[PDB]
Design an enzyme around this catalytic site. Sequence first.
Site, PDB file in Angstrom:
ATOM      1  N   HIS B  41       0.808  -1.223   0.000  1.00  0.00           N
ATOM      2  CA  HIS B  41       0.000   0.000   0.000  1.00  0.00           C
ATOM      3  C   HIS B  41       0.855   1.295   0.000  1.00  0.00           C
ATOM      4  CE1 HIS B  41       0.189   1.175   4.270  1.00  0.00           C
ATOM      5  NE2 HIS B  41      -0.017  -0.098   4.619  1.00  0.00           N
ATOM      6  N   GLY B 143       2.256   6.058  10.266  1.00  0.00           N
ATOM      7  CA  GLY B 143       3.679   6.014   9.949  1.00  0.00           C
ATOM      8  C   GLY B 143       4.361   4.736  10.422  1.00  0.00           C
ATOM      9  N   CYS B 145       3.397   1.668   9.713  1.00  0.00           N
ATOM     10  CA  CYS B 145       3.237   0.621   8.696  1.00  0.00           C
ATOM     11  C   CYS B 145       4.585   0.096   8.242  1.00  0.00           C
ATOM     12  CB  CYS B 145       2.418   1.133   7.517  1.00  0.00           C
ATOM     13  SG  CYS B 145       0.680   1.435   7.901  1.00  0.00           S
TER      14      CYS B 145
HETATM   15  N1  LIG Z   1     -10.108   2.468  11.468  1.00  0.00           N
HETATM   16  C1  LIG Z   1      -9.146   3.016  11.204  1.00  0.00           C
HETATM   17  C2  LIG Z   1      -7.898   3.740  10.926  1.00  0.00           C
HETATM   18  C3  LIG Z   1      -7.208   3.373   9.617  1.00  0.00           C
HETATM   19  S1  LIG Z   1      -7.454   4.365   8.156  1.00  0.00           S
HETATM   20  O1  LIG Z   1      -8.804   4.198   7.722  1.00  0.00           O
HETATM   21  O2  LIG Z   1      -6.964   5.684   8.409  1.00  0.00           O
HETATM   22  N2  LIG Z   1      -6.496   3.712   7.016  1.00  0.00           N
HETATM   23  C4  LIG Z   1      -7.064   2.896   5.938  1.00  0.00           C
HETATM   24  C5  LIG Z   1      -6.176   1.704   5.658  1.00  0.00           C
HETATM   25  C6  LIG Z   1      -6.742   0.560   5.103  1.00  0.00           C
HETATM   26  C7  LIG Z   1      -5.960  -0.525   4.759  1.00  0.00           C
HETATM   27  C8  LIG Z   1      -4.601  -0.453   4.942  1.00  0.00           C
HETATM   28 CL1  LIG Z   1      -3.620  -1.835   4.549  1.00  0.00          CL
HETATM   29  C9  LIG Z   1      -3.997   0.667   5.482  1.00  0.00           C
HETATM   30  C10 LIG Z   1      -4.793   1.738   5.892  1.00  0.00           C
HETATM   31  C11 LIG Z   1      -4.202   2.868   6.740  1.00  0.00           C
HETATM   32  C12 LIG Z   1      -2.741   3.233   6.396  1.00  0.00           C
HETATM   33  C13 LIG Z   1      -2.171   3.711   7.730  1.00  0.00           C
HETATM   34  N3  LIG Z   1      -2.962   2.974   8.728  1.00  0.00           N
HETATM   35  C14 LIG Z   1      -2.552   2.879  10.100  1.00  0.00           C
HETATM   36  C15 LIG Z   1      -1.784   1.799  10.524  1.00  0.00           C
HETATM   37  N4  LIG Z   1      -1.443   1.537  11.793  1.00  0.00           N
HETATM   38  C16 LIG Z   1      -1.872   2.375  12.724  1.00  0.00           C
HETATM   39  C17 LIG Z   1      -2.641   3.534  12.456  1.00  0.00           C
HETATM   40  C18 LIG Z   1      -3.064   4.432  13.468  1.00  0.00           C
HETATM   41  C19 LIG Z   1      -3.755   5.564  13.147  1.00  0.00           C
HETATM   42  C20 LIG Z   1      -4.055   5.858  11.823  1.00  0.00           C
HETATM   43  C21 LIG Z   1      -3.693   5.005  10.821  1.00  0.00           C
HETATM   44  C22 LIG Z   1      -2.977   3.811  11.099  1.00  0.00           C
HETATM   45  C23 LIG Z   1      -4.074   2.397   8.190  1.00  0.00           C
HETATM   46  O3  LIG Z   1      -4.830   1.638   8.765  1.00  0.00           O
HETATM   47  C24 LIG Z   1      -5.106   4.127   6.756  1.00  0.00           C
HETATM   48  C25 LIG Z   1      -7.814   5.150  11.458  1.00  0.00           C
HETATM   49  C26 LIG Z   1      -7.053   4.076  12.129  1.00  0.00           C
END
Ligand SMILES: N#CC1(CS(=O)(=O)N2Cc3ccc(Cl)cc3[C@@]3(CCN(c4cncc5ccccc45)C3=O)C2)CC1
Lengths: 287, 305
Positions: B41, B143, B145
């Site tokens: 991603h 960040g 990830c």
């Molecule tokens: N519910 C919920 C969320 C996720 S999101 O909708 O902002 N988001 C969709 C998504 C979908 C699929 C994939 Cl593979 C990746 C991502 C993302 C990429 C970065 N990330 C994160 C990763 N780790 C911690 C995190 C903390 C805080 C904000 C993001 C974070 C994601 O989850 C972004 C708010 C926490």
Amino acid sequence: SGFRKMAFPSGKVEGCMVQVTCGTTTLNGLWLDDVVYCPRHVISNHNFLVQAGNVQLRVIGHSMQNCVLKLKVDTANPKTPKYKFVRIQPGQTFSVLACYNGSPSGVYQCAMRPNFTIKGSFLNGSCGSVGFNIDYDCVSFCYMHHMELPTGVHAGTDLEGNFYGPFVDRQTAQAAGTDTTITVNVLAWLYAAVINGDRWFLNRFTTTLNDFNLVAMKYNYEPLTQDHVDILGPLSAQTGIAVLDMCASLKELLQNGMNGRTILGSALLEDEFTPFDVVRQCSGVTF
Amino acid sequence: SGFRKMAFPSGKVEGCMVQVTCGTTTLNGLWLDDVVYCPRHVICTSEDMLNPNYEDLLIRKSNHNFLVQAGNVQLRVIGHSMQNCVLKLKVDTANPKTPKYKFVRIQPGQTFSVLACYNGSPSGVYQCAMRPNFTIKGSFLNGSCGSVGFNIDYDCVSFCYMHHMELPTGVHAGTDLEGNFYGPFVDRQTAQAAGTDTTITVNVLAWLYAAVINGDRWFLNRFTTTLNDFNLVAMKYNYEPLTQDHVDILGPLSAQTGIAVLDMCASLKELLQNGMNGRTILGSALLEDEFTPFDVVRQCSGVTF
Ligand SMILES: N#CC1(CS(=O)(=O)N2Cc3ccc(Cl)cc3[C@@]3(CCN(c4cncc5ccccc45)C3=O)C2)CC1
Ligand SMILES: [Cl-]
């Protein structure tokens, strides 16, 4: 999201761990520049065997500083990081790199209790394992393990050989004093729960520092000082909950309990996260 | 004496953390030999996350579009390929700090250490378990990830997890190092929810044996149970079913303490019924499930107190 007991990355400290053997005793040493630091209870130069990985180091001198033995070795450690020796106060937290035979086996985070002991996880052979914090690229060494007390708790010294607590390095009747809860740390952890969306314990009430300290003294909690209140300022501004407002929540948790509820997956009030640890974990500071 | 949630020393993994940038996205990568592994991603925008076609996004990329930073040094990308949900960036320099390693896929109930990173810089290390619902209750911010999960038994690092996303309940989801997700999750911003979580029974039992090793027996009783009766009761508290494999795995701890697995199961049954009554077990007021039978044998002494 998420709140874990997090330790500093241990890599800069792993590159300093050596095995020190004097006769029948085998424990851990900290190799910084051309000196190996280890507990003096390990006891001529060739009597001290120092092993760094598979390499044998040659001891060319020895001296004692308080309860630490300093072995001058022939080779300077090429993996020596930028470092300082610092003495911590009770309530302050640090990471411990637990070692056996000069080989690191685990890393955990803990706090210096108000009774100067650490509730660690140590077995025989762990003596000389060290406690540290990282500030940017500098490793601040604050603890060296020396002994286990009859209640399962641990005692040790700063890197200058001065014990934390009324302890001595010998087999005698030594007991940890009555312990207390680190109030400023519990408050910081309540602010971390609010940041992570846990607000069930918040109430409309406030209190005075005097009235709260009378409650704290009754529940074996450390007194909360004006310094503690000032230190909690940033977290108070971030969440909108005044420190004495959060103290009114703590008073209600102490007088009434949790009632089947948890805070950050815990049924006890957690006191091993300082106000700085909470800000660092809820901001992503790197090393 | 003492029982702590202990993580593996992170030094061998710190020497592999790099920063990967593709356009506006910046996340972490794992540099092993001449390959950098990171979530696919990284090639996506926020808009792209609803329905990303990674093959179509990747085909539009060239090597020089991927910026890799190892400390202050810029690495040159000389090739790229996708394996499931992991992007593999072939670089022109082999990592001199590459430890002995393996890629292992873990099962729920297994524990591992996580080295949390931001901008290719490690900031913390913690210990956790793969929940029965395939999520991890981690501590991750935006960040993080590409941060990785690992075990270090002997001198070999076994990489088992790479962080990809946070779910709406604050829990985390990711993949093994071959890009296969743990759980029914996709690297899409779609309506995805963690299944109902359960307690890892075999781990709670291991932790009760650890308490007996450290001198605590207040919770033991004079009863035993059949395996089926234990499961009928434990399922009512949202505990994972205990299988014959779990019972076999608890054999060494049973022989060390002299308490048969089904006798320890009767103590657990009673603990679920009565609660703790102001008491703690290894400094905890909850029944701990993030220590495996293997972790207990590794951390605790061979001599029972
Ligand atoms: N519910 C919920 C969320 C996720 S999101 O909708 O902002 N988001 C969709 C998504 C979908 C699929 C994939 Cl593979 C990746 C991502 C993302 C990429 C970065 N990330 C994160 C990763 N780790 C911690 C995190 C903390 C805080 C904000 C993001 C974070 C994601 O989850 C972004 C708010 C926490
Ligand atoms: Cl596994």
